[PDB]
Amino acid sequence: AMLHIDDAMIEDAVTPQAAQEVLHAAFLDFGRGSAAMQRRVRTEAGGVKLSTLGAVIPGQGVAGAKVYTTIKGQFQFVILLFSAADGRPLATCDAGTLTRKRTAACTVLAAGALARPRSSVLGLFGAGTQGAEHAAQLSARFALEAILVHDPYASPEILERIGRRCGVPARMAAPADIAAQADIVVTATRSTTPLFAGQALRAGAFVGAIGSSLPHTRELDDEALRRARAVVVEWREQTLSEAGDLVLAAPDTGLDAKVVELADVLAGRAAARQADEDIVIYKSVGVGLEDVALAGYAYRRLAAQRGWPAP
Amino acid sequence: AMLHIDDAMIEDAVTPQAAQEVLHAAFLDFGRGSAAMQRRVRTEAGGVKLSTLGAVIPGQGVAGAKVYTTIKGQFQFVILLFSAADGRPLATCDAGTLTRKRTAACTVLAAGALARPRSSVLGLFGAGTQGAEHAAQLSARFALEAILVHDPYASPEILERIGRRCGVPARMAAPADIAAQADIVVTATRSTTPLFAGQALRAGAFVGAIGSSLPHTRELDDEALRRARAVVVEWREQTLSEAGDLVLAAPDTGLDAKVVELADVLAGRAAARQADEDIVIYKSVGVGLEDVALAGYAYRRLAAQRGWPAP
Ligand SMILES: [Cl-]
Ligand SMILES: [Cl-]
Ligand SMILES: [Cl-]
Ligand SMILES: [Cl-]
Ligand SMILES: [Cl-]
Ligand SMILES: [Cl-]
Ligand SMILES: [Cl-]
């Protein structure tokens, strides 16, 4: 059997701040052209979908792919890691915990660069495990004073849990109230219609639209995209095909000319925010660079800990 | 964790004849539209390539992807196999031996359909792993009396091993003499340019061009394509994009109108050979249907033997 890195191993091996460092470096490599990704490709027959994506990151000594089935809208994932030094397979890796940490770490990287530095109100659409991870990681990055939550399944107990975890009081709020009050809005839903009116967004707001990989899902309306100074994506290529919202946006939004790549933001090449008033949208799809980079870092850390071979 | 199938397990679990039966059935399914494939996709950075391809084959209860690195022409292959019934990951599978077996098995299916039935002279370009496996499986399928081999780098021992494995006298021969004398020609090299003059090919010949899957390399020349009655491919979408033997063809060759898919040949829909004198070319690049189908067969067979869960 190949070495298998499971979710519990990832939970202990990868801190949010390590995840942010690893992803920052991998994106800088991607921007310099010293790392490469495979776009997400989907195949389907008999109601069973198979998808693949991946990356080659020689700067971190790894290459890999994430492969997964989709059946009735449910996913089962395997990440497979190889050595970039000699090409040999290294390990398989669960995707659940890794994806939770990765999604919030990328949102933090983007908000750190593009949200107002003194942001103090976080709005959350969806307060399950991904929403809560975003709240924890963002609370560590910003001096937050409130977390406003919209999720019909949040309970007073979930709110106290998240509040205690973050050290910031969390409370329920209506969608229009979140949009109007929040400096940073994260949307983490399988919605197929817009979560709030673009008109309602606070001046200066950063929106991290995480949403879903599933067909027909979208969270933002044309107005939000039209209002935005910039729409930050992981990769020009994939994110402009993949995402429901970006593909749908009519020529009116001017979306095209305002799309900027995360690597350019992180490298300090984009100058995306011109003014305090600017709205910035970050659209996350998950690209193969991110999974591979974090699984490689986990492999390296667990190997050192356990006497596994170096990548 | 995951169950793993290694190269030694495939060597023992998978005969050529079984591989041919499994692959013939998978192609029929693909031909009927009930199975689907992912084209090969290649990603490269810092001299390290990562490739993926795969398939969903509900009829055989499996889906999966082969993922491999290439570093200086050297490959490391792993198949990730999933259940088409419930989507769950079933196994990792080393795929060195699998790849070797499936490529030769598919060429034997094509030759069985398209070469002269009483073919007795095999011409082989390339006496390495791939060429030798083709010679072995063809020696079982046809009543061969001679194997004529050209490989500019091979030692006398390699040739002696081929003769012994095949139970057929094997000798070194000049490319022009091979082309002139062979009933079946297999090209299994990394040559970037044609190996012999297409004008030299014997009337009636079946030519299995296996070595090239880069759009800038070709093993056959334009005259070969012109002379050929039919050029049979595994899947038009992939082959016509990848195979330099086809990409670089002059319009002169009439290639467009003579391309036929392997599934239509195996289903008895194609009638590709119109005359004994006809030359027929099979251009192979390797496609994900073959990998998935053979990995599923191996899994099922080993699972029955070892008590592993059913797909
Ligand atoms: Cl790609
Ligand atoms: Cl500020
Ligand atoms: Cl959206
Ligand atoms: Cl910026
Ligand atoms: Cl298909
Ligand atoms: Cl005959
Ligand atoms: Cl292959």
The first and second tokens of residue B277, run together, are 């004198």
Residue in chain B nearest A40 by alpha carbon:
B41
Give the phi and the psi of residue B76 in degrees, each rounded to 5: -130, 115
Q: What token pair was written down for A14?
A: 């990868």
Rounded to whole angstroms, the Cα distance separating B138 from B148 reads 13
**Angle, CA B142 vertex, CA B136 and CA B145 arms, to 5°:** 85
Extract the tokens encoding B291: 């990998």
Question: Both B97 and B154 in a single domain?
Answer: no
Residue A153 sits in the same domain as residue A262: yes
Q: Does residue A223 share a domain with residue A302?
A: no
Identify residue B285 by its one-letter amino acid code: V
And the tokens for A155?
């309970």
Distance CA B149, CA B172 (A): 5
Distance of CA A284 from the midpoint of ligand 5 (Å): 28
Amino acid letter, residue B138: L
Consecutive H or E run containing A136: helix A129-141
Q: Using CA atoms, how far apart are residues A166 and A144, in angstroms rounded to an integer?
A: 9
Distance (Å, rounded) from C-alpha A144 to C-alpha B156? 76
Question: Taking CA B295 as the corner, what is the angle to CA A99 and CA B69, rounded to the nearest 5 degrees?
Answer: 55
Residues A81 and A206 in one domain: no
Q: How far apart are CA B24 and CA B186, in angstroms?
A: 20
CA distances from B273 to B116, B167, B233, B279 (A): 10, 29, 14, 8
Q: How many domains does chain B have?
A: 2
DSSP string computed for A216-250: T-----HHHHHH-SEEEES-HHHHHHH-HHHHH--
Q: Is there a single domain that holds both residue B137 and residue B253?
A: yes
CA dihedral B276, B109, B261, B274 (to 10 degrees): 10
Which chain B residues are Cβ-neighbours of A40 within 8 angstroms? Answer: none
Q: C-alpha distances in angstroms, A136 versus A15, A97, A130, B98? A: 12, 15, 10, 46
CA distance B187 to B126: 7
Residue among A244, A225, A253, A238 at smallest CA distance from A286: A238
Please compute, for residue B22, the number of CA atoms within 13 A of its CA located in the half-sphere on the CB side: 28
Judged by DSSP in three states, B268 sits in coil
Q: In terms of domains, do B107 and B184 share one? A: no
Q: Smallest Cα–Cα separation from A219: which of A190, A258, A181?
A: A190
DSSP structure class, residue B276: T
**Half-sphere exposure of residue B70, counting CA atoms within 13 Å on the CB side?**
11
Q: Which structural technique was applied?
A: X-ray
CA–CA gap between residue B59 and residue B57 (Å, rounded): 5
Domain limits for position A120: 116-286
Least Cα distance to B112 among B209, B181, B20, B204 occurs for B20
User: Distance between CA atoms of A79 and A100, rounded to whole angstroms?
Assistant: 14
Which CATH number fits the domain that encloses residue B241? 3.40.50.720
Q: Enter the tokens of residue B120.
A: 């007795």
CA dist., res. A17 & res. A13, Å (int): 12
Q: A35 with A174, same domain?
A: no
Distance CA B26, CA A1 (A): 28
Decide if A225 contacts A252 (C-beta within 8 A): no
Structure tokens at B11: 């060597």
- DSSP, residue by residue, A139-197: HHHS---EEEEE-TT--HHHHHHHHHHHTS-EEE--HHHHHHH-SEEEE----SS-SS-
The alpha carbon of residue B83 is apart from the nearest alpha carbon of chain A, in Å, by 9
Beta strand segments in A73-145, E: 74-83, 89-93, 121-125
Task: Establish if A8 touches chain B: CB-CB under 8 angstroms.
Answer: no
Q: Residue A114 has which token pair?
A: 């593009």
Same domain, A152 and A269: yes
- What CATH number does residue A102 fall under? 3.30.1780.10
- Whether residues B124 and B272 share a domain: the answer is yes
Q: Do residues B254 and B88 touch, judged by C-beta distance below 8 A?
A: no
| Total Cβ atoms within 10 A of residue B276 | 8
- In a shared domain, residues A205 and A238: yes
CA distance B38 to chain A (A): 6
**Residues B36 and B63: beta-carbon distance below 8 Å:** no
B235 and B120: one domain?
yes
The values of phi and psi at residue A117, to 5°, are -55, -35
Q: Note the resolution in Å, 1 decimal.
A: 1.7
A79: nearest CA partner in chain B: B80
Using CA atoms, how far residue B269 sits from A13, B239, B265, in Å, is 57, 20, 6
Cα B155 from Cα A91, distance rounded (Å): 37
Cβ pair B76:A92 closer than 8 A: no
Q: Residues B193, B262: one domain?
A: yes
The dihedral sign for the CA sequence B230, B234, B235, B237 = negative
- Within 14-73 of A, beta carbons closer than 8 Å to B belong to 33-39, 41, 43-50, 52, 54-59, 63-65, 67, 69-71
